[PDB]
Amino acid sequence: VGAXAXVXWXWXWXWX
């Protein structure tokens, strides 16, 4: 569900 690869959103992990 969405567009890309993994879970959640952005790229990487956590927040900033």
Place this chain on the structure above:
Amino acid sequence: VGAXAXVXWXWXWXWX
């Protein structure tokens, strides 16, 4: 690591 919650590139869950 990265920017945003959950692992990987983009938005949602899975790949495509």
